[PDB]
Amino acid sequence: GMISVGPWGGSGGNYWSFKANHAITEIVIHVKDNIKSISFKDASGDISGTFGGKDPRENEKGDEKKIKIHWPTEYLKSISGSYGDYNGVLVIRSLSFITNLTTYGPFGSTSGGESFSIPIADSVVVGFHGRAGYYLDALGIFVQPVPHGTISFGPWGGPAGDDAFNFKVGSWIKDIIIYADAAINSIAFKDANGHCYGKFGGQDPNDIGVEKKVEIDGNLEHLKSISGTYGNYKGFEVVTSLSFITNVTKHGPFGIASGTSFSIPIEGSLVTGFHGKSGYYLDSIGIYVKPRDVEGSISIGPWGGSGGDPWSYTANEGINQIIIYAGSNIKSVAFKDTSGLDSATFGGVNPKDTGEKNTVSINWPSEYLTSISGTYGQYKFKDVFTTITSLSFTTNLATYGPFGKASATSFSIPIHNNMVVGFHGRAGDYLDAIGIFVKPD
């Protein structure tokens, strides 16, 4: 489960990759004028084999530079460098390796090239990829988030804005509502669950702009990336255009393409959030991404009634906390994870009937969710509803609950060798129904 970034450099040579089994602790380059070749080593002593360095010319050859990464206190987090001509072929000319502690390089030549850098954070480099033949034509990285982190790119745009925004979702981005004329005036977003984020921007009464929507069909499509431009608009530096890149198509552009353009060459990603600043307009924006082994999880249930609005929550890392409100039945549920991803509250919408707060703690990852059990049936307040009435959560070490009160119809899952990676169901005033997402382990 990792995100591909890049590669940067020429289009020649053949694709290679090296996904380290253990942390990357060494990089070996041969340099003269350009980068002749690269190889790697992980913490276990495994090596990647050498990419590039293939002539037959012996001179050229290049001086050996070894770069040490002091795992675990130091880890590789990113790279920079430059590309440009060699013998007529577009290749890597210089490289720098960026850790949580310092930067190594640049190695190679700093002049006469197109340089690249990556506006990334909260990442660890767990491998490389690129192109090679006689030379290293191109180089990229594979990244995973730091423990308890979420990879982010950007933001791009200008420095101002009065309202900062920052969110991550536990399902997927389903809708994007943009207002735009020459600039992006505002953006807002909806969850798979129908939860709305923002109106970030559009505070200028004279200048709200013109509404356009992106509607993502989650059965066929997922948001993978963004691109756009930023520049002047009425004296300010703001986002002037955006496009939304999925696995199917590119939506937009929205706004008009002016100033500096930006993009992120990423694959294997799902966008799970956005951060930036807005005021009158959209000053700056960047994304949060999670790796997609989006080909992946088993779903069980839900159990319970058919009322309520459907919801789902999949952890970014590990489910840490459950907040259950209960009385005679389960009014609401909510989840938190070790990376700080907190679900909306599912249920508990009628303030006359919200029950009592219960918190469940899970010492993740040595303790982790494993199953649920409970009952469902009729519950009356003003109307009659069919809901979850009692609920328990089991881990590898413990069973928490039951919360609520037992009604006749019980439910349970005689299941083993699994972990629970998220939940789903229906909720309105109460928790109508609940089930689980599981993976082996």
Place this chain on the structure above:
Amino acid sequence: GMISVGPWGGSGGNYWSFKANHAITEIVIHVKDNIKSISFKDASGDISGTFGGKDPRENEKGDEKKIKIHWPTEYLKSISGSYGDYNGVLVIRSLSFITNLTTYGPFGSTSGGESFSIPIADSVVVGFHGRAGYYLDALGIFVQPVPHGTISFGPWGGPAGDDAFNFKVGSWIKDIIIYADAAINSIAFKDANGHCYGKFGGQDPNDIGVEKKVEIDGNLEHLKSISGTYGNYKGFEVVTSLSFITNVTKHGPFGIASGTSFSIPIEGSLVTGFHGKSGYYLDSIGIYVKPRDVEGSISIGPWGGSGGDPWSYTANEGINQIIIYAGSNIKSVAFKDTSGLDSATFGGVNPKDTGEKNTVSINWPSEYLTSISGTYGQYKFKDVFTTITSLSFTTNLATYGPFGKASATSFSIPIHNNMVVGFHGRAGDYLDAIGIFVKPD
């Protein structure tokens, strides 16, 4: 899911591996006296990068040789070669590449030490691994079964025998029964289900040997490989000693080590059967292996009564067919897979009583098993039994059943985005209990 074989060669340099994403279609070696270096190229054009050849010497470059594999009509299945001293280092001295149609090589010096060969069959080489520094210290391969096949190794031993054996299991080897004194007189095996395999050998009326047992605890251990010796015993060429290699320990030797030794350096393998020849003694023995899954498997259930004997069945490739004999309930169920793996029959141990035969076909892989549901209740013949009363099987395309007759209590599994890879439960005269093994998709 692949098995590692070898590597052969010295302990110098560093470990490396290459697992191709598509079929290996090219191999590049540099040869002078030893193999200076190696790299690979798969059908999409992706390269591995170069292992070895870090020598700063010149008449140390070696001549480049390319080997093409004419995929998909030709595929790599094995290798052979030799290793020995070069400048005081134990390295790969020569190599050959073995295909379904032909052999390429030898490349390098044959005159030189130790040769190696692999008595393998039904394999596809999907990768290599080895050790490399200045030179190519060592090489091995990763393998998978051909479609519908099972990787085999051996047999080792002498060429005669009046009887022959050849079986595979759908659980694992729990027991091994050996009669031995100076040679191996006979061998037998038990399933995890207690089903017995043969007694092969022990036909000398004057010389049957002393019994010894190996018990494998299927919770902390699994059979991985075997080794042993073969040579003369009273004018027969037979297996003289065997040991049984698990992920933890090595059980044996049984018999006495005399004549020629054999071993097969594999990792990632689960032994799933045996083949060979036997008569008075054990003439020859070989193994079947399956990759121990880097993917794990979720268990659900079982549902039903507590009576009976535990059994499990896990498909080698994918479930193809099911046989049930239920009338007023369920005497037995059985299963077949697309690789020829046939399960035992799980109860219908009463001559009297076996209901009517029912064959269910699944178009694996385009059609595949989804879940189950049934009933349990009380069934009476001579006495009273809590068994599974009726039963149904869902796939991604259809349901099959029920069989027999629905009772009071009806269990089901509200599961999605999964495939069933096997079953487990309890059986006697009837199917007391049944549950499933699932994975995502």
